[PDB]
Amino acid sequence: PARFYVGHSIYKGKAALTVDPRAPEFVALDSGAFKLSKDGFLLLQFAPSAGVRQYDWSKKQVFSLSVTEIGTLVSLGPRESCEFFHDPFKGKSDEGKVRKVLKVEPLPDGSGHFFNLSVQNKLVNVDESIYIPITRAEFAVLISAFNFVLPYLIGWHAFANS
Amino acid sequence: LPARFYVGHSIYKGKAALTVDPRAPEFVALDSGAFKLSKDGFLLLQFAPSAGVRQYDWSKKQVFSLSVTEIGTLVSLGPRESCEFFHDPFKGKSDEGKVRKVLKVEPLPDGSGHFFNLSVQNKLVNVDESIYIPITRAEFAVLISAFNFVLPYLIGWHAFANSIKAAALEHHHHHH
Amino acid sequence: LPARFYVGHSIYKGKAALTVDPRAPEFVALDSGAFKLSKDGFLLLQFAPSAGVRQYDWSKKQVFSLSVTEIGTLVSLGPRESCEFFHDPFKGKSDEGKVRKVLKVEPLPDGSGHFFNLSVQNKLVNVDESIYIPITRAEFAVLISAFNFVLPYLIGWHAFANSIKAAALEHHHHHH
Amino acid sequence: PARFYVGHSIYKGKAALTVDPRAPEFVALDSGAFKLSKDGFLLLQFAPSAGVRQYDWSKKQVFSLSVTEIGTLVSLGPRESCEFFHDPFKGKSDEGKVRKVLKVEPLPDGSGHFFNLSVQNKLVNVDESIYIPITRAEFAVLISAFNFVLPYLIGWHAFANS
Ligand code: NI
Ligand code: NI
């Protein structure tokens, strides 16, 4: 029953990014076995700076990277760009009112990358965009982490008990 | 008993679905109480045709196992290299030669994705059917990640790796 | 208490030795009983000069820590790319600016190996010393394997990954 | 205390190869901690065929691949050759009487590889050479296994208890 908070953070002049792994969900079967019913994912939390070495997490914006989206990121060319579009209320009533776009791209003339999260949310009147540049080494740690975590998110470390 | 987990990974498309399930290696107990690997694990691919909007008819499914060596082929493929595998599910058994399955894995025409195509000729029941499914680049990358990850588990080396600490705790040298 | 393991990995050469030790991340208990990551792990490199035939003087050793981000640099290097890291062991402390350490990692001249060179200027004790060690291609490949392996452990993600099963056993959905 | 035999075998027309992982050794310290004192390694066991789908393991020859040698193999170019020379009695009295050479090379005009183990042993009057060709897929499984096992052989999975 041990529970771990192991967010990985990158702190820059104007913004911070925290990446938190989230476990898959399971359903109990009639037989007493468990079936994976939802994949794990990574929760990305972006916040603006508010003073030297501080960030305002009350103004955070979040974006969930799915297993397939992680697939995109680990298979990217060294200088390939990508973009992901989420409506958090697809298939619900509030559909269309919250729009989130995550861009991940190489930095211009540089060896690092940026992450940018824009969120337009009409339910709470928020229109926000947080940009954060990452060094090559920082990106390499992310990619190492993403590659490592993928099989765990789909539960494959957990077959083969016995 | 320890918990048993089902962790099928699925891709759902317009005309077909694919589910991939890992199957554990088998071991035997020895007289000494040691466990010997008796059968490698494998992956089971299950393909099913669409029956309406994002529903599939699993009573019409066709299946194909991927062995450790076939996974080796898949993980070592060039970026746009094709491969093809030929199976007789009853090879060496009495229905040998009755059923032939062909799995093709190839890049999509002028695209960055792949397809899997499973063709089955079953002469026991007069079935000659094929199921095709497209896989995006991102989806394929998840598959290849999973395949690379699972390979050492399928050959039992995980069990070795994870027995090291507990073993050291009982068998170690002591100073003089 | 659980067993504690020392697993230093060493390379011994003609004029110098290098030992690399992993250091675990630190966690804190929370009021809820949950554990929060409080400090990333790192690697400690310890370099020592030869004192005779394959003996080294560890009382003359110089050390250098590699952070998670520095390991990121190392694992992402081009095949013959150079890198260099600059440390002040007392940065932010009262001895800030007294001690400077530089680690260089570069390919060997017209060879397939690498060297590590650690230079230390310690103005507290009038020490200005450097230790150089050559690393073969095979040795470097072991280091890079180890570094890639350890990175998710150093950020605590292993602890996450390995808590999944046990957690599912208690928290899961039940049918209706 | 669970013990596993998980040899991985490749069986061909004239020869078989079995690869068995071997755990590192530890010494108990005064403090109750344990220190890694010998790296793990891989034991390669080669045997000649003796009839259809059978091999004579009484005529086996063996070669221990060290962590550094595994380093060589995982960092090889796609068609790079390598060779390893062992005297099993270096630093002992019988030094010089047993000579073993393992060659691993791409197959000529082919995408597979071969392993060849030659052993000249004057202590028991053995002069033997076992050659086995491996397919690209079979080699890819080996390399996957070798990459996977390396950090375990040096005990790195075992730091961070607590
Ligand atoms: Ni003891
Ligand atoms: Ni329950």
Curated annotation (Swiss-Prot), chains A, D:
Resulting phenotype, G71E: In atwhy1.2; reduces binding activity to single-stranded DNA
Phenotype of the disrupted gene, per the record: No visible phenotype under normal growth conditions, but mutant plants present a progressive lengthening of telomeric repeats.
Motif segment (Nuclear localization signal): 90-103
Coiled coil regions in record: none
Swiss-Prot/TrEMBL keywords: Chloroplast, DNA damage, DNA repair, DNA-binding, Nucleus, Plant defense, Plastid, Transcription, Transcription regulation, Transit peptide
Induction: By salicylic acid (SA) and infection by H.parasitica.
Region (Required for ssDNA binding): 12-17
Primary localization: plastid
GO annotations of cellular component type: chloroplast; chloroplast nucleoid; chromosome, telomeric region; DNA repair complex; extracellular region
GO BP annotations, alphabetical order: defense response; DNA repair; negative regulation of telomere maintenance via telomerase; regulation of DNA-templated transcription; regulation of telomere maintenance; salicylic acid mediated signaling pathway; systemic acquired resistance
Subcellular location: Plastid, Chloroplast; Nucleus
Recorded GO MF terms: DNA binding; mRNA binding; single-stranded DNA binding; telomeric DNA binding
Family label: Belongs to the Whirly family.
Subunit structure: Homotetramer.
Function: Single-stranded DNA-binding protein that functions in both chloroplasts and nucleus. In chloroplasts, maintains plastid genome stability by preventing break-induced and short homology-dependent illegitimate recombinations. In nucleus, modulates telomere length homeostasis by inhibiting the action of the telomerase at the extreme termini of chromosomes. Is recruited to a distal element upstream of the kinesin KP1 to mediate the transcriptional repression of KP1. Is required for full salicylic acid-dependent plant disease resistance responses. Can bind double-stranded DNA in vivo.
Name the UniProt record assigns to this protein: Single-stranded DNA-binding protein WHY1, chloroplastic
Gene source species: Arabidopsis thaliana (Mouse-ear cress)
Section covered of the full-length record: 78 to 239 of 263
